[PDB]
């Protein structure tokens, strides 16, 4: 079909590699494809260089190398393995006394490898390392909140890389330095650095009254050694002030590059703010036996010049994106690598003392367990390491571009006020102002802008076109916020004739401030509107017409869209739906030009120009992390000529290379019998008939048979006391057969466990005697289908003990996995949503005959209530519906770019072209205007919609240009008394489905200590009746219902047992007893040496333990 | 100290704190019996005091004692008693309960004010013992054990048990609740109408008191068991009996949205 795209803005550059923030970060961190001699001192190389040489025998580092993965990605996902590469390090042990050298390559374990799409495979599960925003290290100057005319100087290194130092001018006049919560006069530390009164007087004397507050005679009287011992006594009281100890401590605190590490960005920010040059990333140096200052004097000078009001000195905006930087995958992984390496170095140093001081190899000296433990900890249990969101490809694409202010080394939720969550003016082009979580995490979790990229220092940069004179060049400069604040940047929609600015007045920004400016003052220009918003936000057509609060929900809900079996791209696109499928490697493309040799459901074989025959296998019906089916379908035919970059196979939720998160349905905006009341949605049974919004979902079940002290657990078809009807679909070994239908209660894998030793009750003795049948040795522990689940068994995986290639955790004989899939049709309670924030649950599925329908008999698909539009102020869906009506009758789709798309006149023109097809067809078919159409036109000209006096066709066209049509009620056949908006809308089926969320419980599992029911549907748990529900029951005065909640329905053991027996016997429920959690409270208070006594009216003790706890 | 599903062992931190205490106490006794100098005895006594402090209220004084290879402070008795997760607020002033369920809500315009749509399977589970008794009264099962064994498998469920469940719930009411429960009308009593499907059907007029809408909200259902609880729910808690706000005295169940629009 035809695809019409609007907009006159020409983007000089395409979108960057959307997952490059992960890929390039990790590639720079590993440096695997760089030959070891040509590596830079970065990442793993920097960590090794920092940890070594280990001095004490001297152990030094030469070079590392990374091997090839022992298993591929698919095998890792299959076998619960980490996709990783072996790490080796060539170390030479040197004896500086002997000169002896023993060199060896030691194995340091494995390091997880990032896949092509920017994710990891940890213990079989896909995971993403979310980038972390934080304060950039450096030297900042903030206003002192207590004293207005004063300021605080803050020296901040990298996280975990040293203390924060605070320089302050105390009210008494002396300058204080704050380190590790202790304060002292900065003059003492300056004296340790070797400064004398002459130097300070000549250096800082230009700022009048502060240098005298800096002067202290007793400190200048004593030489730097006495000052060093004095400072050590101030910082470490009680520690005997041995001079070498003081040297070591002060060096490790300030001058040690191993214990103190300003950022490379920190060094750059310090050099740029103070106007100096750093020889390293420490605040001072230990050179020629003494201490030499680096940072302290420039910072103190800047502080004094700022306090004195010396011009050219400013305070720092700490939320400015020039002072806030991103730590990506490589940096966090390298930090944990460095920690593990330091622990390994401690082990090495301890080994260089014990044992034989002569016979030692690098292999004997190195224990790699700390390093492996640190890396495994980071990748498995860190907060920034998250379960990959692969609901649809866009889910993972967005997940990889996430930015978190939380996590280790960052904010807690209470530490986050309004300042951090705010949208800063420097977020322009860097951080999306729309896409952020609704609720407690708002402002803390954000998304990277579309055109943004993180530089090597960690600052987000955005592109701008250079403007010389009045001409806009095609050269683009990626700027940081700090450099962006220098220029006057015009908007991307400023009129142009050629490369020349065609407007006499342009809209521009100066330090984020909007301004009207002459074309001679234009230094740069925006690349595109797309650069201001994230990837998800850039997929919302007519975004300029949607309120931001609802566009947020649209962006966040595109993530939750479920891949449909008949998924299709929207009729109104933004132009990004192809590129998203491209960069999220779900779809398959051709490497070079060539011809398709073979097309199968499982594979595609292509013969390229090179003559080489390349076979691409297709992922078919694979289960994602969230249960959605990831499967690739071939889009080419045998003998087809393809070019470089042509589509070969469609991934999940993609149609011919375009992103397909939902379906295009014929929607009518009107109330309907209160079934769309309060955002609810009414749908047509025709949607289920033609399998719209039907999705495939796979669930994974697992069971282990292990060795017990009572005998082995066995996976077997022989299960005690079971009928052949129960064992029908199990094979010889006890595993359910592939293709069988399983429902709740059915057996997936049969298993027997040896009965725990137990004396049969006398009742069992008499029963056994009556029936004369021996009680079996084993008990039925088979895995069964939980309530509400089931489907078709598509796969079984079995792993035993003693078969080639597999080894389980200790004690486990065998493990069996069963994969069950299900085709889910749309039903009542499932959640739908569009890209504009309109979301609702399906409340009614009507038969086709009850659906409102067009005059030509076409029924609508979805009925949306118009009451959801005015308060929400998201008009983008309305324009989408109008343009979708136009494209529905013209048989074409559209690309309406963001902030530069189809405007109302063009939509009116397309609607006229569509009305011609919609009505002249009828008129040629030999039919005139309907009677009910005439009545609707009467009521419409009463509404001022159509001009009175025109022909019925002219008035119907006037209505059609407004996007409204005559609609017939399928129940009566009479029309709706007014013209109604009808058109094609793109609606998605979200991951929230009633089938997953419906749950109920009579009785079930209880907790160990509290004896209260467990929680969760997965544990068959009960609903929590919290404090506020108790408040509700109290305010109602419902005492017995509340007491049932507190006793019979939970943790009153006698009470609940007697209640169940009474109800199954038809008797009324008994009087409740003492809640077991109260006895738990009594005993836990006794463990705190407190006597809690229940007393009667006579103040006599009452035993709620019934003699069981008293001797 | 319990053995979990896979045969692994899980234990409370109080055991480790008690072990610290007992080790230090026995070491102190042995050091006293062997006549150690006063420096050693003093160190041991101070360690014993620190261990008792750790057992009673860890982190109260000094650094919190942690398990090896972990920064997690061990959970002492004081931590068990106090806090949002403490014994009082988690297990005494509120509990998880039996005979309760939860599902996504859907607008039920055809409902009367005192009614709510309840899914069939939810009702079968919530009223399960009443249903067993009714299936024993009628000839559906020989006894309660056979009725339960029959309800266990979903394919063994015939259509007479649904009529029996209709007979069971006759006249009775259930409690619907939506979090957050800001005022007493966050819980309301409704007569259940059994419905096919998995969604709870809520009356429109009560959506304002629950602050409920249908963009994906879920509600919890509870079954008052006794005749006393059922009477309390039908008389005091019934939706149709609470039409005015206890705060302002104004009508709370009143026309809104589409109703106002049409009128």
């Amino acid at each position: 079909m035809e695809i019409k795209r609007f907009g006159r803005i020409r983007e000089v550059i395409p979108l960057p590699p959307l997952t490059e923030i992960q890929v390039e970060s990790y590639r720079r961190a590993l440096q695997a494809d760089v030959p070891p001699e040509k590596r830079e001192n970065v990442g793993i190389q920097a960590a090794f260089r920092e940890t070594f040489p280990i001095e004490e025998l001297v152990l030094d580092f030469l070079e590392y190398r990374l091997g090839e993965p022992p298993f591929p990605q698919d095998e890792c996902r299959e076998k619960d393995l980490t996709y990783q590469a072996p790490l080796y390090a060539r170390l030479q042990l040197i004896h500086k006394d002997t000169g002896l050298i023993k060199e060896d390559e030691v194995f340091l374990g494995h390091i997880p490898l990032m896949t092509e799409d920017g994710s990891f495979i940890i213990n079989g599960a896909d995971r993403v390392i979310v980038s972390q925003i934080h304060r950039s290290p450096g030297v900042y100057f903030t206003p002192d909140p207590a004293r207005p005319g004063r300021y605080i100087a803050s020296i901040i290194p990298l996280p975990k890389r040293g203390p924060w130092i605070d320089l302050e001018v105390e009210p008494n006049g002396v300058v204080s330095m704050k380190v590790n919560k202790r304060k002292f006069p900065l003059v003492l530390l300056l004296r340790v650095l070797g400064y004398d009164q002459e130097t300070l007087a000549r250096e800082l004397g230009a700022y009048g009254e502060l240098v005298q507050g800096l002067m202290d005679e007793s400190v200048f009287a004593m030489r730097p050694e006495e000052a060093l011992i004095r400072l050590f006594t101030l910082l470490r009281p009680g520690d005997p002030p041995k001079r070498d100890k003081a040297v070591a401590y002060v060096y490790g605190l300030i001058a040690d590059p191993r214990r103190y590490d300003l950022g490379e960005a920190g060094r750059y920010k310090a050099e740029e703010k103070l106007g100096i040059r750093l020889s390293g990333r420490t605040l001072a140096r230990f050179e020629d036996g003494e201490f030499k200052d680096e940072v302290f004097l420039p910072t103190l000078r800047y502080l004094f010049a700022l306090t004195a009001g010396v011009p050219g000195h400013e305070v720092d905006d700490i939320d400015h994106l020039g002072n806030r930087r991103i730590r990506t995958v490589g940096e966090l992984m390298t930090d944990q690598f460095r920690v593990g390496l330091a622990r390994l170095a401690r082990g090495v140093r301890e080994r260089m003392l014990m044992g034989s001081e002569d016979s030692l190899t690098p292999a004997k000296l190195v224990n790699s367990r700390p390093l492996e433990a640190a890396i495994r900890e980071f990748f498995s249990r860190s907060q920034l390491s998250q379960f990959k969101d692969e609901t649809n490809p866009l889910s993972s694409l967005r997940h990889k571009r996430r930015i978190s202010a939380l996590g280790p080394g960052g904010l807690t939720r209470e530490r986050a006020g309004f300042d951090v969550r705010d949208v800063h003016r420097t977020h322009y082009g860097r951080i999306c102002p729309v896409e952020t979580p609704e609720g407690a995490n708002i402002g803390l979790i954000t998304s990277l802008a579309a055109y943004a990229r993180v530089d090597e220092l960690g600052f987000i940069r955005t592109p701008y076109r250079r403007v010389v004179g009045g001409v806009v060049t095609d050269e683009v400069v990626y700027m940081t916020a700090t450099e962006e604040d220098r220029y006057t940047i015009a908007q991307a929609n400023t009129p142009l004739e050629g490369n020349r600015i065609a407007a006499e007045r342009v809209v521009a920004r100066r330090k984020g401030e909007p301004v009207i400016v002459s074309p001679e003052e234009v230094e740069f220009m925006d690349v595109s509107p797309k650069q201001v918003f994230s990837v998800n936000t850039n997929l919302i057509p007519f975004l300029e017409h949607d309120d931001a609060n609802r566009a947020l929900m649209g962006s966040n809900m595109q993530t939750q869209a479920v891949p449909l079996i008949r998924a299709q791209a929207p009729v109104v696109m933004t132009g990004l739906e192809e590129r998203v499928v491209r960069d999220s490697l779900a779809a398959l493309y051709a490497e070079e030009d060539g011809e398709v040799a073979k097309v199968d459901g499982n594979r595609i074989v292509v013969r390229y120009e090179d003559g080489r025959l390349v076979e691409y296998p297709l992922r078919r019906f694979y289960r994602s992390n969230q249960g959605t089916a990831l499967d690739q379908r071939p889009r080419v035919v045998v003998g087809q000529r393809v070019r470089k970059g042509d589509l070969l196979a469609d991934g999940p939720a993609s149609e011919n290379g375009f992103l397909a998160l939902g379906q295009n349905v014929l929607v009518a905006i009107m109330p309907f019998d209160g079934y769309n009341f309060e955002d609810a949605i009414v749908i047509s049974e025709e949607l289920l008939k033609r399998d719209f919004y039907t999705s495939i979902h796979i669930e994974r079940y697992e069971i282990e048979a292990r060795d017990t002290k009572l005998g082995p657990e066995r996976i077997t078809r022989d299960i005690p006391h079971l009928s052949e009807a129960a064992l029908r679909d199990l094979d010889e070994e006890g595993v359910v057969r592939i293709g069988a239908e399983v429902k709740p209660g059915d057996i997936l894998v049969g298993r027997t466990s040896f009965k725990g030793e137990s004396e049969p009750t006398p009742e069992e003795r008499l029963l056994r005697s009556i029936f004369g049948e021996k009680a079996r040795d084993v008990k039925d522990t088979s895995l069964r289908v939980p309530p509400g689940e089931g489907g078709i068994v598509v796969r079984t995986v079995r792993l035993r003990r003693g078969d080639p290639g597999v080894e389980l955790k200790p004690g486990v004989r065998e493990v069996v996995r069963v994969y069950v899939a299900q085709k889910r049709k749309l039903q009542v309670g499932d959640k739908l949503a569009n890209r504009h924030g309109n979301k609702g649950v399906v409340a009614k599925i009507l038969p086709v005959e009850d659906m409102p329908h067009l005059p030509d008999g076409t029924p609508v698909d979805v009925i949306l209530n118009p009451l959801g539009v005015p308060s929400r102020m998201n008009l983008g869906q309305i324009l989408e519906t109008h343009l979708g009506l136009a494209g529905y009758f013209l048989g074409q789709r559209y690309i309406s770019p963001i902030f530069d798309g189809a405007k109302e006149p063009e939509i009116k023109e397309l609607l006229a072209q569509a009305f011609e097809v919609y009505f002249g067809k009828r008129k040629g078919e030999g039919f005139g205007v309907d009677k009910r159409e005439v009545e609707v036109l009467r009521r419409a000209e009463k509404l001022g919609l159509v001009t009175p006096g025109k022909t019925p066709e002219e008035q119907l066209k006037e209505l059609f240009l407004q996007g409204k049509v005559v609609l017939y009620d399928g129940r009566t056949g009479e029309p709706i008394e007014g013209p109604i908006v009808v058109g094609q809308m793109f609606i998605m089926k979200l991951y929230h489905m009633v089938e997953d969320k419906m749950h109920a419980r009579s009785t079930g599992p209880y907790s160990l200590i509290t004896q209260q029911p467990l929680g969760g549907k997965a544990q068959f748990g009960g609903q929590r009746f919290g404090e506020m529900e108790v408040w509700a029951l109290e305010a109602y005065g419902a005492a017995h219902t509340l007491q049932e909640m507190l006793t019979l329905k939970s943790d009153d053991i006698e009470g609940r047992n007697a209640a169940y027996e009474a109800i199954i016997k038809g008797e009324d429920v008994p009087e409740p007893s003492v809640p077991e959690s109260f006895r738990v409270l009594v005993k836990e208070l006794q463990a705190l040496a407190l006597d809690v006594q229940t007393l009667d009216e006579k103040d006599n003790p009452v035993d709620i333990f019934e003699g069981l706890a008293s001797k | 100290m319990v053995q979990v599903d896979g045969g692994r062992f899980a234990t409370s931190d109080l055991n480790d704190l008690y072990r610290r205490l007992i080790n230090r106490n026995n070491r102190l006794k042995k050091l006293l019996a062997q006549g150690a100098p006063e420096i050693i005895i003093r160190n041991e006594k101070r360690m014993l005091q620190e261990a008792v402090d750790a057992l009673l209220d860890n982190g109260r004084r000094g650094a919190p004692v942690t398990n090896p290879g972990s920064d997690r402070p061990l959970r002492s008795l004081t931590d068990i008693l106090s806090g949002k997760q403490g014994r009082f607020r988690q297990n005494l002033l509120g509990k998880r309960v039996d005979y309760s369920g939860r599902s996504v809500i859907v607008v039920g315009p055809q409902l009367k004010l005192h009614q709510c749509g309840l899914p069939k399977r939810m009702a079968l589970e919530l009223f399960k013992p009443f249903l067993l008794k009714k299936m024993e009264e009628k000839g559906i099962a020989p006894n309660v054990k056979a009725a339960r064994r029959m309800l266990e498998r979903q394919r063994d469920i015939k259509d007479e048990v649904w009529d029996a469940l209709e007979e069971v719930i006759h006249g009775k009411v259930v409690l619907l609740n939506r979090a957050p429960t800001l005022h007493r009308l966050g819980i309301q009593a409704f007569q259940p109408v059994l419905v096919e499907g998995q969604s709870i059907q809520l009356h429109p007029l009560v959506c304002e008191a629950f602050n409920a809408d249908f963009d994906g909200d879920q509600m919890a259902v509870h079954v008052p068991l006794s005749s006393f609880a059922q009477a309390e729910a039908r008389i005091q808690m019934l939706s149709a009996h609470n039409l005015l706000s206890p705060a302002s005295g104004e009508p709370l169940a009143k026309p809104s949205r589409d109703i106002i629009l049409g009128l």
Partner: peptide, 14 residues
């Protein structure tokens, strides 16, 4: 407040 430092100080007195 630090038991290790206190014990080391007590040890340093002999």
């Amino acid at each position: 407040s630090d038991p290790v430092r206190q014990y080391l100080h007590e040890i340093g007195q002999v």
